[PDB]
Design an enzyme around this catalytic site. Structure first.
Site, PDB file in Angstrom:
ATOM      1  N   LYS A   1     -13.436  -1.428   6.122  1.00  0.00           N
ATOM      2  CA  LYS A   1     -14.020  -2.356   5.165  1.00  0.00           C
ATOM      3  C   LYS A   1     -15.006  -3.366   5.734  1.00  0.00           C
ATOM      4  CE  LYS A   1     -10.100  -0.700   3.443  1.00  0.00           C
ATOM      5  NZ  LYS A   1     -10.150  -0.387   1.986  1.00  0.00           N
TER       6      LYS A   1
ATOM      7  N   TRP B   1       0.878  -1.158   0.000  1.00  0.00           N
ATOM      8  CA  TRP B   1       0.000   0.000   0.000  1.00  0.00           C
ATOM      9  C   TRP B   1       0.925   1.219   0.000  1.00  0.00           C
ATOM     10  CZ3 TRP B   1      -2.027   2.933   4.694  1.00  0.00           C
ATOM     11  CH2 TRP B   1      -3.117   3.758   4.351  1.00  0.00           C
TER      12      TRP B   1
ATOM     13  N   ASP C   1      -0.393  -5.134   9.835  1.00  0.00           N
ATOM     14  CA  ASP C   1      -1.407  -4.234   9.301  1.00  0.00           C
ATOM     15  C   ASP C   1      -2.577  -5.157   8.968  1.00  0.00           C
ATOM     16  OD1 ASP C   1      -3.079  -2.550   7.867  1.00  0.00           O
ATOM     17  OD2 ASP C   1      -1.401  -1.428   7.010  1.00  0.00           O
TER      18      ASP C   1
HETATM   19  C1  LIG Z   1      -2.997  -2.300   3.706  1.00  0.00           C
HETATM   20  C2  LIG Z   1      -3.966  -1.169   3.996  1.00  0.00           C
HETATM   21  N1  LIG Z   1      -3.652  -0.608   5.235  1.00  0.00           N
HETATM   22  C3  LIG Z   1      -4.356   0.440   5.769  1.00  0.00           C
HETATM   23  C4  LIG Z   1      -5.428   0.959   5.037  1.00  0.00           C
HETATM   24  C5  LIG Z   1      -6.089   2.114   5.789  1.00  0.00           C
HETATM   25  O1  LIG Z   1      -7.409   1.950   6.150  1.00  0.00           O
HETATM   26  P1  LIG Z   1      -8.347   3.089   6.787  1.00  0.00           P
HETATM   27  O2  LIG Z   1      -9.073   2.602   7.929  1.00  0.00           O
HETATM   28  O3  LIG Z   1      -9.110   3.617   5.594  1.00  0.00           O
HETATM   29  O4  LIG Z   1      -7.397   4.137   7.340  1.00  0.00           O
HETATM   30  C6  LIG Z   1      -5.885   0.490   3.733  1.00  0.00           C
HETATM   31  C7  LIG Z   1      -7.070   1.068   2.931  1.00  0.00           C
HETATM   32  N2  LIG Z   1      -6.585   1.073   1.471  1.00  0.00           N
HETATM   33  C8  LIG Z   1      -7.733   1.178   0.460  1.00  0.00           C
HETATM   34  C9  LIG Z   1      -8.578   2.450   0.700  1.00  0.00           C
HETATM   35  C10 LIG Z   1      -8.011   3.806   0.213  1.00  0.00           C
HETATM   36  C11 LIG Z   1      -6.650   4.157   0.819  1.00  0.00           C
HETATM   37  O5  LIG Z   1      -6.667   4.375   2.043  1.00  0.00           O
HETATM   38  O6  LIG Z   1      -5.731   4.179   0.044  1.00  0.00           O
HETATM   39  C12 LIG Z   1      -7.160   1.151  -0.986  1.00  0.00           C
HETATM   40  O7  LIG Z   1      -5.847   0.814  -0.988  1.00  0.00           O
HETATM   41  O8  LIG Z   1      -7.838   1.434  -2.065  1.00  0.00           O
HETATM   42  C13 LIG Z   1      -5.100  -0.600   3.249  1.00  0.00           C
HETATM   43  O9  LIG Z   1      -5.290  -1.245   2.061  1.00  0.00           O
END
Ligand SMILES: Cc1ncc(COP(=O)(O)O)c(CN[C@@H](CCC(=O)O)C(=O)O)c1O
Ligand SMILES: Cc1ncc(COP(=O)(O)O)c(CN[C@@H](CCC(=O)O)C(=O)O)c1O
EC number: 2.6.1.1
Lengths: 396, 396
Positions: free
Chosen positions: B246, B130, B211
């Site tokens: 999610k 990410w 994570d």
């Molecule tokens: C590995 C990972 N860690 C942490 C998060 C963080 O989650 P939150 O609770 O939203 O803080 C996401 C959300 N990734 C999604 C959503 C958009 C983003 O945050 O980039 C995605 O990768 O499309 C993730 O994919």
């Protein structure tokens, strides 16, 4: 690796609150944390807020992510509250506003922004001030200096000392100011003093940072913003961190905003994009509920009128308590004059009680106040006033 | 002071959403952000959630501050999900949980905690991963290093490239692991591989940081925490940043948790005090609404049941699209085997498309995906599948 960590002290404020929950004796009185309480001693949720919440429950169709900077309408509404419906700063589009998790959150993103994107190395805060101010800026690696503010002899604003104290604040230095209801003294500059500070600020080259956590708790919504507006008409750049925690009774929903002001639309947008990067690397994007409620209220003429009435009642009850506090102190046998309490603004009053006395009130009379002598007037009720005043007189 | 700030580049994920919103083509297809969508193309509010909000609306008597670490029940409930009802980590009272503003917030507090109270200097992140993982850690002053993970050619996990890379992780270093549903590959280790990494983890002396943003999207609640539970039962210290965005569809309410695990109860408590200090200087205290919802659903058996039912429907709808996606691609004339997509877990799929192809999909067909070629299978519906596959084949 965790065995080498040395414990952290307790929050001078937040800490106190857990001890109160710990205290076993009946009759305890909590005058610590700054939360509003009505005549019955409870921190209710405003009617305007319950209304907005029902509206959101009926019409929300999704919890999809908000943009990094939060609800669009939220920002527009806060900018009007701060600068005025027809402000020039707004018309020339010199301001951008990001929805943050509380005023604390606005202070932190402002701090992360400055640390990573400017040459700012020092932030000047008043002494005394809200304790967490120093912790917030230090977390971004910024050195924090202090300037003089309170005249503990005359229980007034020591203006000459303040001016002299800031003589060594350089161009490019950040200078923090409390919009109104200075925490913890309750003493704010007059319009004349603000105007003077506004002038000195431009001539010295300071970057003004306003912390506005109590708009509406001093004189009124428009009145409480005069200091800031005098600065806004004089400055090219400035930052303001505001909170809706107290004036909307939304404490735990963490609703606040960080507003950036630059010389023109082009510069502010460029700078704002970096503020967003700092937000993205922190919490990614802001919690919707609290901000939705506020934007819903500020945008609806009916809800807005109600809310304004509720704020007025909150403000007036506090001032009423200030009077009743001073009177009951006399009736109970205090020879020290506490008349100055009536001249102070907001929730907190600087009682002038020594740390010793504060500890005595706590362990001997079950009355809690912050060790600095700060007492929450919003926590006083017709029911605990007598027991309260009687204890204070005892420690005098 | 703001004149020389250089603009920030758009976020690789969030930026897309703004472009998508602006695009005027009526047939646009959004496959970027990791947000769930039902068979009709909308991101609904779960029925369990809506019910909880109703209870909250009719029962909250105050919006009073939550306390640095948040709602207690919330903390207990997430620890059982992460460790299991009768975990020994819970019994020996070795874990402390702090409610945070989303999973991203959990990552930042952990990062600030480490950089300010330990000797930790480097952080190991899978390659790829990410994108925001590097921004979060670099902002706290921690250096970031990447380790091999994905086998491009075989569209599988290169367990050999992984372990060889991690041989360079000195003792005391931090190594980031995705609990399940790796982002962006979708390829997770088997229990056997987790077993290995766990033991090798204790031998090389690393601080494991997990994570956990998709518990429930791979196989199931318990099944998804297996790798974690394997590390848990073996390490003395570890950090787990989890998100409820999610699996609860509470994206914009920012509901997450940062959990600390130490050797014993006194050590974790001492270390947790600094974590609370890190939080206090960030946003002070967490947003109540979303976390409240999670807490009440997980505490009510009749609601829990409904929620788990809803989670399962989401996991299953995504499996049915993954299959349908592979079948349709062949039918629309793909000259390749995308069969490797059925083996991927979660909401995404590493398509294999190049940046230039991903670009053409956006520019000429209005189909939005992440530049790395990551696609959101959860955004595919029976209705957009055909147009969607024709566009890909056309750029193939
Ligand atoms: C590995 C990972 N860690 C942490 C998060 C963080 O989650 P939150 O609770 O939203 O803080 C996401 C959300 N990734 C999604 C959503 C958009 C983003 O945050 O980039 C995605 O990768 O499309 C993730 O994919
Ligand atoms: C000057 C000042 N700035 C910022 C804040 C922070 O606002 P939030 O929206 O809560 O982030 C407070 C609240 N100070 C109160 C409340 C408790 C606390 O946070 O210390 C007090 O002074 O007891 C404040 O007095």
């Amino acid at each position: 690796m965790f065995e080498n960590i040395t414990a952290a002290p307790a929050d001078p404020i937040l800490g106190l609150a857990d001890l109160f929950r710990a205290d076993e004796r009946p009759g305890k009185i909590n005058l610590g944390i700054g939360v509003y309480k009505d005549e019955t001693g409870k921190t209710p949720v405003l009617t305007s807020v319950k209304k907005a919440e029902q509206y959101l429950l009926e019409n929300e169709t999704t919890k999809n992510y908000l943009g990094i900077d939060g609800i669009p309408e939220f920002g527009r509404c806060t900018q009007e509250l701060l600068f005025g419906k027809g402000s020039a700063l707004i018309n020339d589009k010199r301001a951008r506003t990001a929805q943050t998790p509380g005023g604390t959150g606005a202070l932190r993103v402002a701090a992360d922004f400055l640390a990573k994107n400017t040459s700012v190395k020092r932030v000047w805060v008043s002494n005394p001030s809200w304790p967490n101010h120093k912790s917030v800026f230090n977390s971004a690696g910024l050195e924090v200096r202090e300037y003089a503010y309170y005249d503990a002899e005359n229980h007034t604003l020591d203006f000459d000392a303040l001016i002299n104290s800031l003589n060594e604040a350089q161009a490019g230095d950040v200078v923090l100011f409390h919009g109104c209801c200075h925490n913890p003294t309750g003493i704010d500059p007059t319009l004349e003093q603000w105007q003077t500070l506004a002038q000195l600020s431009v001539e010295k080259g300071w970057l003004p940072l306003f912390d506005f956590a109590y708009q509406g708790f001093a004189r009124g919504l428009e009145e409480d913003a005069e200091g800031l507006r005098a600065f806004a008409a004089m400055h090219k750049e400035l930052i303001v961190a505001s909170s809706y925690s107290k004036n909307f009774g939304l404490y735990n929903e963490r609703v606040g905003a960080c507003t950036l002001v630059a010389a023109d639309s082009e510069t502010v947008d460029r700078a704002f994009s970096q503020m967003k990067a700092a937000i993205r690397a922190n919490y990614s994007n802001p919690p919707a509920h609290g901000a939705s409620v506020v934007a819903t209220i500020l945008s609806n003429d009916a809800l807005r009128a109600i809310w304004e009435q509720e704020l007025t009642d909150m403000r007036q009850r506090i001032q009423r308590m200030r009077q009743l506090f001073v009177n009951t102190l006399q009736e109970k046998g205090a020879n020290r004059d506490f008349s100055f309490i009536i001249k102070q603004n907001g929730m907190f009053s600087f009682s002038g009680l020594t740390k010793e006395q504060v500890l005595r009130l706590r362990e001997e009379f079950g009355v809690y106040a912050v060790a600095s002598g700060r007492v929450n007037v919003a926590g006083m009720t017709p029911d605990n006033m007598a027991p309260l005043c009687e204890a204070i007189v005892a420690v005098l």
